Amino acid sequence: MDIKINDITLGNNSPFVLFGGINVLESLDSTLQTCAHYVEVTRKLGIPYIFKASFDKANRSSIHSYRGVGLEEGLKIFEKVKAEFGIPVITDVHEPHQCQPVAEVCDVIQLPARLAAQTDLVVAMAKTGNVVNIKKPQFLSPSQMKNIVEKFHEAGNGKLILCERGSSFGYDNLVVDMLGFGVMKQTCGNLPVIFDVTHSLQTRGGRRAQALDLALAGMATRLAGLFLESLHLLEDFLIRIKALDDLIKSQPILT
Amino acid sequence: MDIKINDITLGNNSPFVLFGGINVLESLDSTLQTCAHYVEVTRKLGIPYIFKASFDKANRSSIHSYRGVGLEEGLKIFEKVKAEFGIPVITDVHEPHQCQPVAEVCDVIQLPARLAAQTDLVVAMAKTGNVVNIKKPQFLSPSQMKNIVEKFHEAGNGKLILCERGSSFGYDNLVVDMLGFGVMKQTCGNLPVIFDVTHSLQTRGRRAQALDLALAGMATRLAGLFLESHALPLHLLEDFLIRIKALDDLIKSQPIL
Amino acid sequence: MDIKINDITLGNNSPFVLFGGINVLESLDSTLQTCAHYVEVTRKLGIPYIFKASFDKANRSSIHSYRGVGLEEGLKIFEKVKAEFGIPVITDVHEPHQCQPVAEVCDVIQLPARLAAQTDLVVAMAKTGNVVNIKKPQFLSPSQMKNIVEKFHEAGNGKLILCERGSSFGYDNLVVDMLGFGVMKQTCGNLPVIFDVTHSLQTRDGRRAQALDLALAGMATRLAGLFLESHPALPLHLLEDFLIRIKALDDLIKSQPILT
Amino acid sequence: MDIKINDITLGNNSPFVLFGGINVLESLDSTLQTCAHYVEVTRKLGIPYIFKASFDKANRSSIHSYRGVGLEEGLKIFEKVKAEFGIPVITDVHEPHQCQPVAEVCDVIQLPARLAAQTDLVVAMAKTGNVVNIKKPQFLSPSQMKNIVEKFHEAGNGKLILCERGSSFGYDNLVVDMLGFGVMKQTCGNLPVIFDVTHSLQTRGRRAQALDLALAGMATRLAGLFLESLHLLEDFLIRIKALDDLIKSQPIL
Ligand SMILES: [Cl-]
Ligand SMILES: [Cl-]
Ligand SMILES: [Cl-]
Ligand SMILES: [Cl-]
Ligand SMILES: [Cl-]
Ligand SMILES: [Cl-]
Ligand code: NA
User: Fold this and answer.
1) How far is C167 from chain A (nearest CA, A)?
2) What is the CATH number of domain B1-257?
3) How far is it, in rounded angstroms, from Cα C233 to Cα C22?
4) Which numeric CATH code is attached to C1-260?
5) CATH 3.20.20.70 at A1-255, yes or no
6) How far is D173 from chain B (nearest CA, A)?
7) How many A/B residue pairs have CB atoms within 8 Å?
8) Which reaction does this enzyme catalyse, per its entry (chain C)?
């Protein structure tokens, strides 16, 4: 099942879409500068691009870490990003009441992994009618994602993306089960599956070289998109991902 | 570090405290009946007791599933439990705005494991000044429980209970690391550690397994045991707790080495 | 099901048996000195005791690390331990051909975890008719132990002990699933289950306090025995204090009927 | 570091080598038939090929289950495979004393994962001087493979292949850490790394899974693949080769 996000087609058989940006919105000027860099590199390679940022991030590592500019200013910034670059945007929500006003502006709304069982939030997100990115908890098996999907369906929204972020592996560490992508596709109606490589590595060319190996591995399994918190470095990385993706997506799925 | 909860002393070298009750509040009369049974059993065995229940099941598998009586009716039921039996109570909270009204009534407020990184909820819980029960996420190592403790300390509340509920073990299965209790004591300032045996087992009769697991955890010298009955059958409660108390008494009588 | 090992009754409802000793037999006099300490302490507390050591340690951290005294001298040392102290002994075997000579001398023979799928070894061990200790691999689930037991049964030997040593938990780390003991009892005909606390902790960074916590926890589930190693591994002088606490818990647990 | 195996170059920046065959040797004719199919498919796709089989099933569910032809008959069959097809072969050894006679015939000898810490077997294997395939235990971290390599080096053999077979993931299940390949390269002197897809999946249709997993691992840039595996082998290898050729043509970053 494909999802149209303005002029982008997101689907496990379509050219991969990059989801990237910055962690938390600080100002219009800094957001535009970072967005402009992603836009320039992705335009140069022809890769569809969706800008990601939080306006109020509720799960930072310290209680006094800046959570972002907040809803009202955050949405003004997203409006300007959309107007300037003509791209879709994605942000996370954690309060039911925030879902509607965010969905006026942001093309995709993201359900944080740890909140993915929270019924009130799921319902409020579903009822926006927007495209939703469901972050897969590290403690949920891929065959259980169908249960979250079911709750969105009961609440009237099928425009759902499944986002892999790794699985708990002993203490501290995460492993990405490359078989889980296929299990999600088979059990969840071939909804678009995207790969959050950055979180999948947080517990581990150094880190750059790891992120490349892990991203290539995941994309080899035929995915709708790649998701980062992460210059000539981005360009070189995307060149390699686009090469693999083009090869994979050009071949028919097996008989 | 011990914590006083009314007349109860909760601590890792004190007689164990039972946090027991039910999954979700459904009605006044059924709650009072179940609570009466826990009270009469615990009082005769001389085990300190705190009644547990949720007023809302916030994360059920269907949007149409029964969720419980809800906050307003739930707090009325807890007020009646306290007035009738004179015991402390514990319940979980899922949103910041609920923390102040719940804390006015409920002696211990609980941080659900999946929500333990939500800064807004940690701050709202901390600011109540109530005793807080921190459910340890299944995906968090025992040496990282200190990170959750740190956040509560930064928000000005040190009356914290660390509650084991198992660790993720492959897909859809949990294992309880009996060594993690010690790690949590050593790295979190010897705050009271309790063991949620019920949720530790949910992924795998079960009566015999609950007893074996509970006895194993309590062997490591813990402040308390956390469990649910309807979950153990309610009539086996007395026999179960006779065994747990026999082991706790023995362990607690041996000098720490 | 109980197993008699000379005058010792080994079983999940009997007073726990200590299997203890050393990693590798390296000398006569030092072995006897270590054994003498375990004997003195276990006699003092009334705990049944079986002396454990390897005569050939197959899994050394370097290839030229001393393997141990080898089969022929190793068996002589075991004979001396038996003659001097009057206790049973346990050792591991690695090859079919070693099963008969080791079984003539040793009261229990042990199937190393990594070798537990080797059919030739399982048959040769079974055919000795000796009591066998089966080490549970860290990568085998407790419900799979029955398949090793089945093979011993097909080969005509039911005098089997099942020995927990932990389960793989992420990379280079072990957890002991306290529920596995019960799964093994239920699926393997209530054969004696013992706990190797030493090898269950090898991947953890003191260590004395960990060994005690882990040992108590396991013994709380009602087990036939505890399996450990010391060095002159627990320090050998702390043995009495450790065993006092284990015996206290075991006596309490064992004195209460199983809860139906 | 590359390893020459007759005319094949095995290395993490070389075209991938397929190691494939059957579980256990049962008879000459059935072995030749299976080998012929692999040879025909790999030749027409231009993929270097090493035939794999066990002469002994050391590891069965009944004491009365079939064990395979055994060492002496097994080595006769391997000699015939080599003579007929002119390809290298690989087999596993489980006891020190088998290492020299097996190594006289088989180009690559394989150290079973469960036996990888058995010092006597490591030394006996090393002393043959043959190419050795070291199966990574499902319980060992990739950064610990360097300690096995060190033992083979101390024993005088550096012609070592590291082989991924998955990692224990709770009870009765395996997961493959796609980051472990890189860790093994970085810490073990860029010895060839190959991927045993078959044994990585044994605890998990299945054909589609094997393809996804094989594509994912080969994306990390590897020397070779194990595939025990309508024309399924051919269809699978076509896709693997396309991805391998692409990956191997990109400069290392
Ligand atoms: Cl998560
Ligand atoms: Cl709870
Ligand atoms: Cl959890
Ligand atoms: Cl041992
Ligand atoms: Cl093992
Ligand atoms: Cl293995
Ligand atoms: Na004997």
Assistant:
1) 11
2) 3.20.20.70
3) 9
4) 3.20.20.70
5) yes
6) 7
7) 74
8) D-arabinose 5-phosphate + phosphoenolpyruvate + H2O = 3-deoxy-alpha-D-manno-2-octulosonate-8-phosphate + phosphate
